[PDB]
């Protein structure tokens, strides 16, 4: 709940308003100008959120920042590993699915993010063994995204932590 304190704080960069026309979120500040060192880890701290107002602004917040972060995402990757780990370690199936879709987005959001994630497989991947078989196929699809964008060392490091992993493509 560092996000619950972030929420409705002053620095919170999203406008808390709902326009009927959709589910877009209104940014008070331009995403391009945010210091991702400060904001992206706070939004990832919301991956644990499941209560109604918070979970939406956490997820849509992460989505836009990853979609428009560009070269701001890689320099911040180290700061995201603890929030990712913590969300997954709840062993909540819904937090794990939201986090997995986010991890998929993470490794395609900018060059080298997928490769830079490899040294942290042993910190984030273990929980997925419990749920390795719809969560099972989402784990499989996520691990393939990791390997696809992970460089030459990706599979071996996925297999060390997920012994049952196999993937052609």
């Amino acid at each position: 709940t560092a996000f619950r304190k972030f929420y409705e704080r002053g620095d919170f960069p999203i406008a808390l308003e709902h326009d009927s026309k959709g589910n877009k979120i209104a940014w008070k500040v331009e995403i391009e100008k945010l210091d991702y060192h400060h904001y992206l880890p706070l939004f990832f701290d919301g991956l644990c959120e499941m209560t109604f107002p918070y979970e939406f602004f956490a997820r849509q917040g992460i989505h836009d920042m990853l979609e428009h972060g560009g070269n701001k995402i890689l320099p911040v990757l180290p700061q995201l590993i603890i929030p990712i780990k913590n969300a997954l370690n709840l062993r909540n199936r819904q937090v794990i699915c939201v986090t997995l879709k986010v991890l998929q987005h993470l490794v395609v959001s900018a060059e080298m993010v997928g490769k830079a994630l490899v040294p942290y497989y042993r910190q984030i991947l273990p929980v997925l063994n419990i749920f390795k078989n719809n969560i099972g196929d989402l784990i499989q699809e996520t691990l393939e995204a990791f390997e696809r964008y992970g460089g030459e060392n990706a599979f071996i490091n996925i297999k060390y932590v997920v012994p049952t992993y196999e993937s052609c493509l």
Binding site: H37, P75, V76, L77, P78, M112, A116
Partner: protein
Amino acid sequence: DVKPKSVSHAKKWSEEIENLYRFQQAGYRDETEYRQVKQVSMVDRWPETGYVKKLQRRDNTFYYYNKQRECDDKEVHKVKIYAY
């Protein structure tokens, strides 16, 4: 081992250049290296201006930074800008 790809030099002052100045004064490329080198929960910043307030140097002494801008126009060109 997240490291920048390339380095350029600033040409006009900015909020970004100011904080990059303050990191590089204390001996860090940016907040990415500073958090790599030191166990860091938060980087202490000024409330009104966001600028870096204090930094623990490699030899564990501390540099303190003014609430207002410190990087004068003469120094702007010396700030290194790292791409990731």
